[PDB]
Amino acid sequence: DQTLKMIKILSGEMAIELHLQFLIRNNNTDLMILKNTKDAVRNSVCHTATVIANSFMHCGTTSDQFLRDNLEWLARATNWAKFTATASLGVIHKGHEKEALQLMATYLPKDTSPGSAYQEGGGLYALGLIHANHGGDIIDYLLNQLKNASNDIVRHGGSLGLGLAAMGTARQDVYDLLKTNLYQDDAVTGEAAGLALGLVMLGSKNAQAIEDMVGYAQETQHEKILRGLAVGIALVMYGRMEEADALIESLCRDKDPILRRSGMYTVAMAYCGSGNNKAIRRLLHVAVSDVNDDVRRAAVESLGFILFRTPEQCPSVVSLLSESYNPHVRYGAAMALGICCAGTGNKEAINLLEPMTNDPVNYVRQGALIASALIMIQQTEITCPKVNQFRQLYSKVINDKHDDVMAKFGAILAQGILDAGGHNVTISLQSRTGHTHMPSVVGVLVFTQFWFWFPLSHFLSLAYTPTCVIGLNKDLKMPKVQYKSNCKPSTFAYPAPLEVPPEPNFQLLDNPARVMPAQLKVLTMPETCRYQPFKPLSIGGIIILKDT
């Protein structure tokens, strides 16, 4: 009703559990792939790589069999891979209130009490992963446990998951234990405090809190505390276009390379998608003048974030920088492509990324594979032929013995990136309205910083967005529509695994039906059905389907 209307449209659950319905009904994944990557048994990053890869390709589908296949190779690596193990569960159970506490009923920190306070500590991380942008009992339940706990072995998970659930909410309550979390004088609380300290104050420009943060990041001696805040003071200002330039000028004026880097980020967030002359002069000049490599890499990775609106311009400027003398600019160049053109199958950008795996530096070979994953998600051989040209390539590098673990790390990560959600989720830094999707923007921005923390780029679940229509007539009732398409039916290709031990263009589609955004224009309206949509079917998502 109109009384129920605030719950229907403001809690917005009938896209949460209904896209969750689309995930639990639509699942096109493989066991054989992780059987092929199972062979790489060594105590390197590989364990965390696989157990983050299946979480990448099983976002929100609640499928526990790639973990429940074993316990030994799962819990083989220790002391942070169990923290990553309890991290990876909430992405699998993303967007679902019920199967959060009850499946982690083993994994509460007070039930079994093993010698791993990480396996039991990092649960609230994953609870924040499930209930990001859903502030409820997650706030005070994930807050009063943080009033009294151990040191920063559970406080990382509760802090990150807590600020993640309270992301962009301006809450004094979490701001209190974020104050005393900030003033611990502890090194290991830096990622715990400086991240959520910005997360709860997204776009707030609370200049007293800015003065607290940059006033705090000028005297300590540890660097992780100088890094989480270096993300947070970027995060507090968002889309301002002029309202930070004195502060950007201050941070770039400072001698601290980490703080200049943080200014790079901050100017990367105050200019999202806006092709401004004011940002692009200094920003590009900071990646040419400055002497630290980190600020050069963030300086060139600001470009897709400020210029994802027109993806035709970043291949024109960054290919000029693919051949720099340093592999740092050669690396953030490739990730600048990977953040700019990731929504499209840009044949020119793939053409740029073709020799980027050839370079004699391991990490630019790596980020070549990450950007190569981001350019072609949900694209099957007809948007661009390079898809299966690279499917053999990720196997080609992952099945070598003589490569680097870092070299194959972008491939094993790029698997779960490339086949994410059973070809049902996608990245979108952009709504159809023209408005950008700022949790996806935060997800890719935080996703950049796997240099200094590995489950830091586990924050990618906010970028995974559907490509699916939903037909609907009431608040709840499914109709039964079957419309088709008109154009070439080979666009509708699937992964179709091989499993080694006369052309219909009428793709009949139900209500929870996946459809490519390129395939939104090639479909056919239902004209002979009893149900006929009152909205012109241009966007997917969810619509009213009027019973005629």
Partner: protein, 287 residues
């Protein structure tokens, strides 16, 4: 455990101590002590280094006298400020950097004292400007090598950034010790007072530079510049001839007039114009 993201900070003075004491007695493996604040599980900040005199003749590492470092530890205690010994070093002179069997013994005598002691190798020959070459190390347990288990549990893309040298790879490299990425701490308080003081003329360009011999030296370049230009009237004429790659390999026995010419044009040019302008300012300034 560690995450191969240890990130040793050092100094701006200890590098100078290492190159000076490592250079003065350079063919013998000299050594000494390291002295700084031991910050958290990841990082360490070694602010000071004092060296130790040797035991006798012989290329090795001698020994350590706790009488001597007990006293020297207290000289700065009652004069400057207290610090803590954190590491130590020696000097592979013109070798590169690794751990010898003698090095790993005296390391092993130090890690039992403090588990996060630091081995440091200076190489004061193969350094020129941008290649200082230190690569601080520390032992890994061979027990886990017997276990066949991989230590050090990478949680950060910070370790595998520098590729190891092939000679240390021949040595104990990855079976007995690990590398540590390091960097330096500096400030404009130092940067200005070393930049503004290293190469400074005083009033020298406000002179006239041997005013008889200026024009005489000008003659003393132009005179052979004539015959060198005659060789430029010799070397052009074998073009419209054999290929310029043969006109590249073929010119490795005898001089060319081209590059040798444009050298002397520059030398005469900048030699003259400075003496001209510097000659003419003093006419205004002095009366």
């Amino acid at each position: 455990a560690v995450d191969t993201a240890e990130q040793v900070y050092i100094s701006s003075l200890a590098l100078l101590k290492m190159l000076k004491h490592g250079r003065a007695g350079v063919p013998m493996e000299v050594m000494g002590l390291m002295l700084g604040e031991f910050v958290d599980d990841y990082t360490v900040r070694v602010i000071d280094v004092f060296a130790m005199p040797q035991s006798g003749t012989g290329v090795s590492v001698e020994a350590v006298d706790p009488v001597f470092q007990a006293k020297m530890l207290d000289m700065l205690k009652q004069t400057g400020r207290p610090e803590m010994v954190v590491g130590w070093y020696h000097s592979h002179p013109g070798f590169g950097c690794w751990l010898s069997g003698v090095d790993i013994n005296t390391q092993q005598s130090f890690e039992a004292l403090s588990e996060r002691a630091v081995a440091v190798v200076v190489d004061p020959i193969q350094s020129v400007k941008g290649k200082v070459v230190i690569d601080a190390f520390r032992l890994i347990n061979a027990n886990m090598m017997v276990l066949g288990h991989e230590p050090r549990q990478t949680t950060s893309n910070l370790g595998h950034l520098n590729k190891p040298s092939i000679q240390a790879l021949i040595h104990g490299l990855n079976r007995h010790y690990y590398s540590i990425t390091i960097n330096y701490r500096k400030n404009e308080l130092e940067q200005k007072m070393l930049l503004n003081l290293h190469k400074k003329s005083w009033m020298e360009g406000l002179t006239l530079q041997d005013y008889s011999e200026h024009c005489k030296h000008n003659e003393s370049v132009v005179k052979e510049m004539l015959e060198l230009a005659k060789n430029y009237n010799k070397a052009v004429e074998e073009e419209d001839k054999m290929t310029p790659e043969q006109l590249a390999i073929k010119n490795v026995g005898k001089q060319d007039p081209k590059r040798h010419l444009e050298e002397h044009v520059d030398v005469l040019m900048t030699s003259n114009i400075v003496q001209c302008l510097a000659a003419m300012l003093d006419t205004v300034v002095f009366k």
